[PDB]
Amino acid sequence: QSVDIHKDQIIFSEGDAGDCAYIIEKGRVLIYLTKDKEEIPLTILGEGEIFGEMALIDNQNRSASVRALEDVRLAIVTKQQVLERVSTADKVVQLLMRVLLKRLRSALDQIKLENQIFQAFQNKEFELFYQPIVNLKNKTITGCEALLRWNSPQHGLVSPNLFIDIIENSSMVIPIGHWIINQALKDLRTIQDQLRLNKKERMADDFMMSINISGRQFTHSDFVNNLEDLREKHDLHTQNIKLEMTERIMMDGAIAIDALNQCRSLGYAISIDDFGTGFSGLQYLTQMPISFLKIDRSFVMKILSDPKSKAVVSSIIHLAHAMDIEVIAEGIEHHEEALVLETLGARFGQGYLFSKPVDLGRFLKLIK
Amino acid sequence: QSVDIHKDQIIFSEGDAGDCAYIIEKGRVLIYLTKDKEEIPLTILGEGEIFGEMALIDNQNRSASVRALEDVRLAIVTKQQVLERVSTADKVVQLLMRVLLKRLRRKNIGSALDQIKLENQIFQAFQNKEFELFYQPIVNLKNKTITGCEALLRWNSPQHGLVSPNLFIDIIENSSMVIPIGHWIINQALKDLRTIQDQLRLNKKERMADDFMMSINISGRQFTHSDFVNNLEDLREKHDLHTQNIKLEMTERIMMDGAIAIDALNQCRSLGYAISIDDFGTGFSGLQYLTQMPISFLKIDRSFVMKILSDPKSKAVVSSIIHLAHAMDIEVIAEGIEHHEEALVLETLGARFGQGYLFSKPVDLGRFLKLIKL
Ligand SMILES: Nc1ncnc2c1ncn2[C@@H]1O[C@@H]2COP(=O)(O)O[C@H]2[C@H]1O
Ligand SMILES: Nc1ncnc2c1ncn2[C@@H]1O[C@@H]2COP(=O)(O)O[C@H]2[C@H]1O
Ligand SMILES: [Mg+2]
Ligand SMILES: [Mg+2]
């Protein structure tokens, strides 16, 4: 709601309590101090500008007095509205705000890790490993997923729990992601060449390299174009490249409603990773041109003990079939789990039972 | 990533371009201005404090010079790190930042508007009593009996002429005014439940009265807010009602949290409140949690129901939700039902309950009390 005010009206004085702040819609206002009954002007504010906001942010008194130079109309910003928005803001953005207030009158660790990660990337401490995906019935290796690893010389082998999230919600996903795709496709060509070299011509034609693509780099412009360049750079075919995505992409939709269709039109397979976790698929599933979905490991490890977690999984498999989507059950660590998973009708699987993620040299041996 | 610096080294001067900012790990530093080769000190910064951040935020030159008073070690904050975090921040929080920069610089030398206004307009309307509750019948699909109702919030005003009238519900739900408004909703809904049950007993429909369920929408904020279950219990006892007749409709998004929100539902369930997941299959998905949550109902959203007959794989999604629900002793309420053909398919797939225009639109208490009697 908006409020009219008379010329020369002292709206509030220096030292008052801070109920709310204002945004000027019409008119002009003067901010001033008072010292031994001398009146020193700080500035004149006009249309679009704000005042009374400092007291609300740090719960202290009015740093100055304010008087209307003419008839003005103000739009009210409440204390709760300000604190609400300041509290949700990033911890560094809050540091920045607080320090600016003081002067006008873990964050260190978070900043250092982001730079440590990026420096490691440039010192080439990251490399891709590849985990076999197998046909459950005949145990043949049908394809693989590219997984990012980091082994610093000083901190040994690093947990991906740490760096993956940090990378994904930063702009460094673009240069890193480009490197991931390029490396994964380079090694696909090498995999197919080795397969043809040992006269496994049909296995070579059906081989699928799964690459994880995050939201940021998907929604980023010129993605499909740069992807196509990298594909042609290694003389590869679209039917051997499968893009693993989180459900969350369809929250957006400026380019992200038909970007998938543009990917699908070129022959790239699209797969929904960690289905049944995070943003919900069931409606997103009727929209999206999906060829696969992956049943997360959290489901698979409760199949034998929890009998209604089994029911959830059975239902996902049957639903998937009903829309010509195929299933990859991941996290498989015991033969008994595979048995149930095949009886329920899941075609593919991946997990420790078959193979952990390994480097390209161990993987090339595995396929033979 | 961390950098050592010599005593008396001018790290940067006033008027330079701003490549990066620094955080002091060791030592002390002096910020100063220069005027006709007079050096006026602004302050001394020490361990843990920051400098060089202003130039990065608004792309302008260094407002001052900086010199190390002793041997110091600095941790670098890049421009990209700062802009990255500032850009994602709320539009008002960005306004606040930019205005503070302008005033500090001058000091030592000498849609967001619309979102904010609508929030206050909504709250003023609430206090001027422009809101009221309507009630939409939920029916048993097979025998068409009214089994219960959902309380729906209305705003009787031309200004609420959004016509896509969800909007204000969303504005309320993601604001702190959900607490005083929500309290009013719950109180009003429970008051009218007592009136519904009294009429039902008055016409010797004793069994229908015992099975009647009033569905109330409860948002995340007020659910996660402390002292919720206690205040709910007070309002229930205020109207002499039983927990088995009160059903709480919740969005899936609550299980993102879990400090209080894994067992808050169990604390509600322990008291006998039915819990229902509204708009299931939209927004967040608590599937790995849905084996855990004490859920008695879920509602198939209208967006699914209106595509059942045209889109044959939207039908498959709905069939699958119903079968899954049954497999964990959860019952289904299909909403948005506007044609008899939809109800047919919905009953064949096995959904027990329904609500929609086919049966009845939302109406005031009054038209609802008449509706029961048929
Ligand atoms: N140096 C300044 N330049 C411009 N505006 C100021 C200055 N100091 C204070 N203000 C504004 O005047 C207000 C006085 O009360 P607050 O501290 O609540 O919020 C203050 C600012 O919005
Ligand atoms: N009044 C002040 N009090 C304390 N520090 C300041 C003040 N003015 C500027 N600074 C710091 O000195 C730095 C000079 O360059 P920047 O403008 O990039 O960033 C500035 C702030 O970090
Ligand atoms: Mg993956
Ligand atoms: Mg509802």
Coordinates of N, CA, C and O in Angstrom, one line a residue, chain A residues 1 23 25 45 50-51 53-54 57 75-78 80-82 84-86 89-90 92-93 95-97 99-101 103-105 108 110-112 114-116 119 169-172 216 276-283 285-286 298-299 302 306 308-309 311-312 315-316 319 322-323, chain B residues 1 23 25 45 50-51 53-54 57 75-78 80-82 84-86 89-90 92-93 95-97 99-101 103-104 107 113 115-117 119-121 124 176 221 252 281-288 290-292 301 303-304 307 311 313-314 316-317 320-321 324 327-328:
Chain A
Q1 N 0.8 -1.2 0.0 CA 0.0 0.0 0.0 C 0.9 1.3 0.0 O 2.0 1.3 0.5
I23 N 9.8 3.4 -0.2 CA 10.3 3.6 -1.5 C 9.5 4.8 -2.2 O 8.3 4.8 -2.2
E25 N 7.7 7.0 -4.7 CA 7.0 6.9 -5.9 C 6.9 8.3 -6.6 O 7.0 8.4 -7.8
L45 N 17.1 12.4 -1.9 CA 16.6 11.2 -2.7 C 15.4 11.5 -3.5 O 14.5 12.3 -3.1
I50 N 15.2 4.3 -2.1 CA 14.7 3.8 -0.8 C 15.3 4.5 0.4 O 16.4 5.1 0.3
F51 N 14.6 4.5 1.5 CA 15.2 4.9 2.8 C 14.5 4.3 4.0 O 13.4 3.8 3.9
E53 N 15.8 1.7 5.5 CA 16.1 0.3 5.4 C 17.2 -0.2 6.4 O 17.2 -1.4 6.7
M54 N 18.1 0.7 6.8 CA 19.2 0.3 7.6 C 18.8 -0.2 9.0 O 19.3 -1.2 9.4
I57 N 17.5 -3.8 9.0 CA 18.5 -4.9 8.7 C 19.2 -5.4 10.0 O 19.4 -6.6 10.2
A75 N 5.8 4.2 -0.9 CA 5.3 2.8 -0.9 C 6.0 2.0 0.3 O 7.3 2.0 0.4
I76 N 5.3 1.4 1.2 CA 5.8 0.9 2.4 C 6.5 -0.5 2.3 O 5.9 -1.4 1.6
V77 N 7.7 -0.6 2.8 CA 8.3 -1.9 3.0 C 8.4 -2.2 4.5 O 9.0 -1.5 5.2
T78 N 7.8 -3.3 4.9 CA 7.8 -3.7 6.3 C 9.1 -4.3 6.7 O 9.9 -4.8 5.9
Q80 N 9.4 -7.1 8.4 CA 9.3 -8.6 8.1 C 9.7 -8.9 6.7 O 10.3 -9.9 6.4
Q81 N 9.2 -8.0 5.8 CA 9.5 -8.2 4.3 C 11.0 -8.1 4.1 O 11.6 -8.9 3.3
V82 N 11.7 -7.2 4.8 CA 13.2 -7.0 4.6 C 14.0 -8.2 5.2 O 14.8 -8.8 4.6
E84 N 12.9 -11.2 6.1 CA 12.6 -12.3 5.3 C 13.5 -12.5 4.1 O 14.0 -13.6 3.8
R85 N 13.7 -11.5 3.3 CA 14.5 -11.6 2.1 C 16.0 -11.6 2.4 O 16.8 -12.3 1.7
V86 N 16.5 -10.9 3.4 CA 17.9 -10.9 3.8 C 18.3 -12.2 4.4 O 19.4 -12.7 4.1
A89 N 19.1 -14.9 1.7 CA 20.2 -14.6 0.8 C 21.4 -15.3 1.2 O 21.6 -15.7 2.4
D90 N 22.3 -15.6 0.2 CA 23.6 -16.3 0.4 C 24.4 -15.7 1.6 O 24.4 -14.5 1.8
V92 N 27.5 -15.2 2.0 CA 28.5 -14.2 1.6 C 27.8 -12.9 1.3 O 28.3 -11.8 1.7
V93 N 26.7 -12.9 0.7 CA 25.9 -11.7 0.4 C 25.4 -11.0 1.7 O 25.3 -9.8 1.7
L95 N 27.2 -11.3 4.6 CA 28.5 -10.7 5.1 C 28.7 -9.3 4.4 O 28.9 -8.4 5.1
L96 N 28.5 -9.3 3.1 CA 28.7 -8.1 2.3 C 27.8 -7.0 2.8 O 28.2 -5.8 3.0
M97 N 26.5 -7.3 3.0 CA 25.5 -6.3 3.5 C 25.9 -5.8 4.9 O 26.0 -4.5 5.1
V99 N 28.8 -5.7 6.5 CA 30.1 -4.9 6.5 C 29.8 -3.5 5.9 O 30.4 -2.5 6.3
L100 N 29.0 -3.4 4.9 CA 28.6 -2.1 4.3 C 27.8 -1.2 5.2 O 28.0 0.0 5.2
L101 N 27.0 -1.8 6.0 CA 26.2 -1.1 7.1 C 27.2 -0.4 8.1 O 27.0 0.7 8.5
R103 N 30.3 0.3 8.0 CA 31.2 1.4 7.4 C 30.5 2.7 7.1 O 31.0 3.8 7.3
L104 N 29.2 2.6 6.6 CA 28.4 3.8 6.4 C 28.1 4.5 7.7 O 28.1 5.7 7.8
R105 N 27.7 3.7 8.7 CA 27.6 4.2 10.1 C 29.0 4.6 10.6 O 29.1 5.5 11.4
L108 N 34.5 -17.9 4.7 CA 35.9 -18.0 4.3 C 36.2 -19.4 3.7 O 36.8 -19.5 2.6
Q110 N 34.0 -21.7 2.6 CA 33.2 -21.9 1.4 C 33.9 -21.3 0.1 O 33.9 -21.9 -0.9
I111 N 34.4 -20.1 0.3 CA 35.1 -19.4 -0.8 C 36.4 -20.0 -1.2 O 36.6 -20.1 -2.4
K112 N 37.1 -20.5 -0.2 CA 38.4 -21.2 -0.5 C 38.2 -22.6 -1.2 O 39.0 -22.9 -2.1
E114 N 35.7 -23.5 -3.2 CA 35.3 -23.2 -4.6 C 36.5 -23.0 -5.5 O 36.6 -23.4 -6.6
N115 N 37.5 -22.2 -5.0 CA 38.7 -21.9 -5.7 C 39.7 -23.1 -5.7 O 40.4 -23.3 -6.7
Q116 N 39.7 -23.8 -4.6 CA 40.5 -25.1 -4.6 C 40.1 -26.1 -5.6 O 40.9 -26.6 -6.3
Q119 N 41.0 -24.8 -9.1 CA 42.5 -24.8 -9.3 C 42.9 -26.3 -9.6 O 43.7 -26.5 -10.5
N169 N 26.4 -26.0 -8.7 CA 25.8 -24.7 -8.5 C 26.8 -23.6 -8.5 O 27.0 -22.7 -7.6
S170 N 27.6 -23.6 -9.6 CA 28.6 -22.5 -9.8 C 28.7 -22.4 -11.4 O 28.3 -23.3 -12.1
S171 N 29.2 -21.3 -11.8 CA 29.4 -21.0 -13.3 C 30.5 -21.8 -13.9 O 30.6 -21.9 -15.1
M172 N 31.4 -22.4 -13.0 CA 32.5 -23.3 -13.5 C 32.0 -24.6 -14.0 O 32.8 -25.4 -14.6
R216 N 22.2 -26.2 -15.3 CA 22.8 -24.9 -15.7 C 23.4 -25.0 -17.1 O 23.0 -24.2 -18.0
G276 N 12.2 -40.5 -9.0 CA 11.5 -40.7 -7.7 C 12.2 -40.0 -6.5 O 11.9 -40.2 -5.3
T277 N 13.2 -39.1 -6.8 CA 13.8 -38.3 -5.9 C 13.9 -36.9 -6.4 O 14.0 -36.7 -7.6
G278 N 13.8 -35.9 -5.5 CA 13.8 -34.5 -6.0 C 12.5 -34.0 -6.6 O 11.4 -34.5 -6.2
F279 N 12.5 -33.3 -7.7 CA 11.3 -32.8 -8.4 C 10.6 -33.9 -9.0 O 11.2 -34.9 -9.5
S280 N 9.3 -33.9 -9.1 CA 8.4 -35.1 -9.4 C 8.3 -35.3 -10.9 O 8.1 -34.3 -11.7
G281 N 8.4 -36.5 -11.3 CA 8.4 -36.9 -12.7 C 7.1 -37.1 -13.3 O 7.0 -36.8 -14.5
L282 N 6.2 -37.6 -12.6 CA 5.0 -38.3 -13.2 C 4.3 -37.4 -14.2 O 3.8 -38.0 -15.2
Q283 N 4.2 -36.1 -14.0 CA 3.7 -35.2 -15.0 C 4.8 -34.8 -16.0 O 4.5 -34.8 -17.3
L285 N 7.0 -36.5 -16.9 CA 7.2 -37.7 -17.7 C 6.3 -37.8 -18.9 O 6.7 -38.4 -19.9
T286 N 5.1 -37.2 -18.8 CA 4.2 -37.2 -20.0 C 4.6 -36.1 -21.0 O 4.3 -36.3 -22.2
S298 N 19.0 -45.9 -3.5 CA 18.2 -45.9 -2.2 C 17.0 -46.8 -2.2 O 16.6 -47.4 -1.2
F299 N 16.4 -46.9 -3.4 CA 15.3 -47.9 -3.6 C 15.8 -49.3 -3.6 O 15.3 -50.2 -2.9
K302 N 16.7 -51.4 -0.4 CA 15.6 -51.7 0.5 C 14.6 -52.7 -0.1 O 13.6 -53.0 0.6
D306 N 12.5 -54.3 3.0 CA 11.3 -53.5 3.1 C 10.3 -53.9 1.9 O 10.6 -53.6 0.8
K308 N 7.4 -53.0 0.9 CA 6.6 -52.0 0.2 C 7.5 -51.1 -0.6 O 7.1 -50.3 -1.5
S309 N 8.8 -51.0 -0.2 CA 9.8 -50.4 -1.1 C 9.9 -51.3 -2.4 O 10.2 -50.7 -3.5
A311 N 7.3 -52.7 -3.7 CA 6.1 -52.3 -4.4 C 6.3 -51.0 -5.2 O 5.8 -50.9 -6.3
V312 N 7.0 -50.1 -4.6 CA 7.3 -48.8 -5.3 C 8.1 -49.1 -6.6 O 7.8 -48.6 -7.6
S315 N 6.2 -50.9 -9.4 CA 5.3 -49.9 -10.0 C 6.0 -48.9 -11.0 O 5.5 -48.6 -12.0
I316 N 7.2 -48.5 -10.6 CA 8.0 -47.7 -11.5 C 8.4 -48.5 -12.8 O 8.3 -47.9 -13.9
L319 N 5.1 -48.9 -14.9 CA 4.8 -47.6 -15.5 C 5.7 -47.3 -16.7 O 5.3 -46.9 -17.7
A322 N 4.9 -49.1 -19.7 CA 3.6 -48.6 -20.3 C 3.8 -47.4 -21.2 O 2.8 -47.0 -21.9
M323 N 5.0 -46.8 -21.2 CA 5.2 -45.6 -22.1 C 6.5 -45.8 -22.9 O 7.2 -44.9 -23.3
Chain B
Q1 N 46.1 -20.1 -3.7 CA 44.8 -19.7 -3.2 C 44.9 -18.7 -2.0 O 44.0 -17.8 -1.9
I23 N 40.5 -11.5 1.9 CA 40.1 -11.8 3.3 C 41.4 -12.0 4.1 O 42.2 -12.9 3.7
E25 N 43.9 -13.4 6.6 CA 44.1 -14.6 7.5 C 45.1 -14.3 8.6 O 45.0 -14.7 9.7
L45 N 42.2 -2.7 9.3 CA 41.5 -4.0 9.3 C 42.4 -5.1 9.7 O 43.6 -5.1 9.5
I50 N 37.4 -8.2 5.4 CA 37.5 -8.2 4.0 C 37.8 -6.8 3.4 O 37.5 -5.8 4.1
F51 N 38.4 -6.8 2.2 CA 38.5 -5.5 1.5 C 38.7 -5.7 0.0 O 39.0 -6.8 -0.4
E53 N 36.1 -5.4 -2.1 CA 34.8 -6.0 -2.5 C 33.9 -5.0 -3.2 O 33.1 -5.5 -4.0
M54 N 34.1 -3.8 -3.0 CA 33.2 -2.7 -3.5 C 33.3 -2.6 -5.0 O 32.3 -2.6 -5.8
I57 N 31.5 -5.4 -7.0 CA 30.0 -5.5 -7.0 C 29.4 -4.5 -8.1 O 28.4 -4.9 -8.8
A75 N 43.6 -14.3 1.6 CA 42.8 -15.3 0.9 C 42.0 -14.7 -0.2 O 41.2 -13.8 0.1
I76 N 42.2 -15.1 -1.4 CA 41.6 -14.4 -2.6 C 40.1 -14.7 -2.8 O 39.7 -15.9 -2.8
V77 N 39.3 -13.7 -3.0 CA 37.9 -13.8 -3.5 C 37.9 -13.2 -4.9 O 38.2 -12.0 -5.0
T78 N 37.5 -14.0 -5.9 CA 37.5 -13.5 -7.3 C 36.3 -12.7 -7.6 O 35.3 -12.7 -6.8
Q80 N 34.3 -13.2 -10.1 CA 33.3 -14.1 -10.6 C 32.6 -14.7 -9.4 O 31.4 -14.9 -9.4
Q81 N 33.3 -15.0 -8.3 CA 32.7 -15.6 -7.1 C 31.7 -14.6 -6.5 O 30.6 -15.0 -6.0
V82 N 32.1 -13.3 -6.5 CA 31.2 -12.2 -5.9 C 30.0 -12.0 -6.7 O 28.9 -12.0 -6.2
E84 N 28.6 -13.9 -9.1 CA 27.9 -15.1 -9.0 C 26.9 -15.2 -7.9 O 25.7 -15.5 -8.1
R85 N 27.3 -14.8 -6.7 CA 26.5 -14.8 -5.5 C 25.5 -13.6 -5.4 O 24.4 -13.8 -5.0
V86 N 26.0 -12.5 -5.9 CA 25.1 -11.3 -5.9 C 24.0 -11.4 -6.9 O 22.9 -10.9 -6.6
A89 N 21.0 -13.4 -5.7 CA 20.2 -12.9 -4.6 C 19.0 -12.2 -5.0 O 18.9 -11.7 -6.1
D90 N 18.0 -12.1 -4.1 CA 16.7 -11.5 -4.4 C 16.9 -10.0 -4.9 O 17.8 -9.3 -4.5
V92 N 15.3 -7.3 -4.4 CA 15.3 -6.2 -3.3 C 16.6 -6.2 -2.6 O 17.1 -5.1 -2.2
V93 N 17.2 -7.4 -2.3 CA 18.5 -7.5 -1.6 C 19.6 -6.9 -2.5 O 20.6 -6.4 -2.0
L95 N 18.9 -4.3 -4.8 CA 18.6 -2.9 -4.6 C 19.3 -2.4 -3.3 O 20.1 -1.4 -3.4
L96 N 19.2 -3.1 -2.2 CA 19.8 -2.7 -0.9 C 21.3 -2.6 -1.0 O 21.9 -1.7 -0.5
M97 N 21.9 -3.6 -1.7 CA 23.4 -3.6 -1.9 C 23.9 -2.4 -2.7 O 24.8 -1.7 -2.2
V99 N 22.4 0.5 -3.3 CA 22.2 1.8 -2.6 C 23.2 2.1 -1.5 O 23.7 3.2 -1.3
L100 N 23.6 1.0 -0.8 CA 24.6 1.1 0.3 C 26.0 1.5 -0.3 O 26.8 2.2 0.3
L101 N 26.3 0.9 -1.5 CA 27.6 1.3 -2.2 C 27.7 2.7 -2.5 O 28.7 3.4 -2.3
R103 N 26.1 5.3 -1.3 CA 26.2 6.2 -0.1 C 27.5 6.2 0.6 O 28.0 7.2 1.1
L104 N 28.1 5.0 0.7 CA 29.5 4.9 1.3 C 30.5 5.6 0.5 O 31.4 6.3 1.0
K107 N 30.1 9.2 1.0 CA 30.4 9.5 2.4 C 31.8 9.8 2.7 O 32.1 11.0 3.1
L113 N 9.0 -4.2 -6.5 CA 8.1 -3.2 -6.0 C 6.6 -3.8 -6.0 O 5.9 -3.7 -5.0
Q115 N 5.6 -7.0 -6.2 CA 5.5 -8.2 -5.3 C 5.3 -7.7 -3.9 O 4.5 -8.3 -3.2
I116 N 6.0 -6.7 -3.5 CA 5.9 -6.1 -2.1 C 4.6 -5.5 -1.9 O 4.0 -5.6 -0.8
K117 N 4.0 -4.7 -2.9 CA 2.7 -4.1 -2.8 C 1.6 -5.0 -2.7 O 0.6 -4.8 -2.0
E119 N 1.6 -8.2 -1.7 CA 1.7 -8.8 -0.3 C 1.0 -8.0 0.7 O 0.3 -8.5 1.6
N120 N 1.2 -6.7 0.7 CA 0.5 -5.8 1.7 C -1.0 -5.5 1.3 O -1.8 -5.4 2.2
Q121 N -1.3 -5.5 0.1 CA -2.7 -5.4 -0.4 C -3.5 -6.7 0.1 O -4.6 -6.5 0.6
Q124 N -4.0 -6.5 3.9 CA -4.9 -5.5 4.3 C -6.3 -6.0 4.0 O -7.2 -5.8 4.8
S176 N 5.2 -14.7 5.8 CA 5.0 -14.9 7.2 C 3.5 -14.7 7.6 O 3.1 -15.0 8.7
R221 N 5.3 -23.7 5.6 CA 5.7 -22.7 6.7 C 5.0 -22.9 8.0 O 5.7 -23.0 9.0
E252 N 3.8 -32.1 -1.2 CA 5.0 -33.0 -1.1 C 6.2 -32.4 -0.5 O 7.0 -33.0 0.2
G281 N 2.4 -36.0 -7.4 CA 3.0 -36.2 -8.8 C 3.3 -34.8 -9.4 O 3.6 -34.8 -10.6
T282 N 3.2 -33.7 -8.7 CA 3.6 -32.4 -9.1 C 4.6 -31.9 -8.1 O 4.6 -32.3 -6.9
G283 N 5.5 -31.0 -8.6 CA 6.4 -30.3 -7.7 C 7.4 -31.3 -7.2 O 7.9 -32.2 -8.0
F284 N 7.7 -31.3 -5.9 CA 8.7 -32.2 -5.3 C 8.1 -33.6 -5.3 O 6.9 -33.8 -5.2
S285 N 9.0 -34.6 -5.3 CA 8.6 -36.0 -5.1 C 9.3 -36.6 -3.9 O 10.5 -36.7 -3.8
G286 N 8.5 -37.1 -2.9 CA 9.0 -37.8 -1.7 C 8.9 -39.3 -1.8 O 8.5 -40.0 -0.9
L287 N 9.2 -39.9 -3.0 CA 8.9 -41.3 -3.2 C 9.7 -42.2 -2.3 O 9.1 -43.2 -1.8
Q288 N 11.0 -41.9 -2.0 CA 11.8 -42.8 -1.2 C 11.3 -42.6 0.3 O 11.6 -43.4 1.1
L290 N 8.0 -41.8 0.8 CA 6.6 -42.2 0.8 C 6.4 -43.6 1.4 O 5.2 -44.0 1.7
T291 N 7.4 -44.4 1.5 CA 7.4 -45.7 2.3 C 7.3 -45.4 3.8 O 6.8 -46.2 4.6
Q292 N 7.8 -44.2 4.2 CA 8.0 -43.8 5.6 C 6.8 -43.0 6.1 O 6.4 -43.2 7.2
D301 N -4.0 -34.6 -8.9 CA -4.2 -33.3 -9.3 C -5.1 -33.2 -10.6 O -5.1 -34.1 -11.4
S303 N -4.7 -31.5 -13.2 CA -3.9 -31.5 -14.5 C -3.8 -32.9 -15.1 O -3.7 -33.0 -16.3
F304 N -3.7 -33.9 -14.2 CA -3.7 -35.3 -14.7 C -5.1 -35.7 -15.2 O -5.2 -36.2 -16.3
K307 N -6.4 -34.7 -18.8 CA -5.7 -35.3 -19.9 C -5.9 -36.8 -20.0 O -5.3 -37.5 -20.9
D311 N -4.9 -37.9 -23.8 CA -3.6 -38.4 -23.7 C -3.5 -39.8 -23.1 O -3.8 -39.9 -21.9
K313 N -1.2 -41.9 -22.3 CA -0.1 -42.2 -21.4 C -0.2 -41.4 -20.1 O 0.4 -41.8 -19.1
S314 N -1.0 -40.3 -20.1 CA -1.4 -39.6 -18.9 C -2.4 -40.5 -18.1 O -2.4 -40.4 -16.9
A316 N -2.1 -43.8 -18.1 CA -1.1 -44.8 -17.5 C -0.5 -44.3 -16.2 O -0.3 -45.0 -15.3
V317 N -0.1 -43.0 -16.2 CA 0.4 -42.4 -15.0 C -0.6 -42.5 -13.9 O -0.3 -42.9 -12.7
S320 N -1.3 -46.0 -12.5 CA -0.1 -46.4 -11.7 C -0.1 -45.8 -10.3 O 0.3 -46.5 -9.3
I321 N -0.5 -44.5 -10.2 CA -0.7 -43.9 -8.9 C -1.7 -44.5 -8.0 O -1.5 -44.8 -6.8
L324 N -0.4 -48.1 -6.9 CA 0.6 -47.9 -5.9 C 0.0 -47.4 -4.6 O 0.3 -48.0 -3.5
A327 N -1.5 -50.3 -2.8 CA -0.4 -51.2 -2.3 C 0.2 -50.8 -1.0 O 0.9 -51.6 -0.4
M328 N -0.1 -49.6 -0.5 CA 0.3 -49.1 0.8 C -0.8 -48.7 1.7 O -0.6 -47.8 2.6

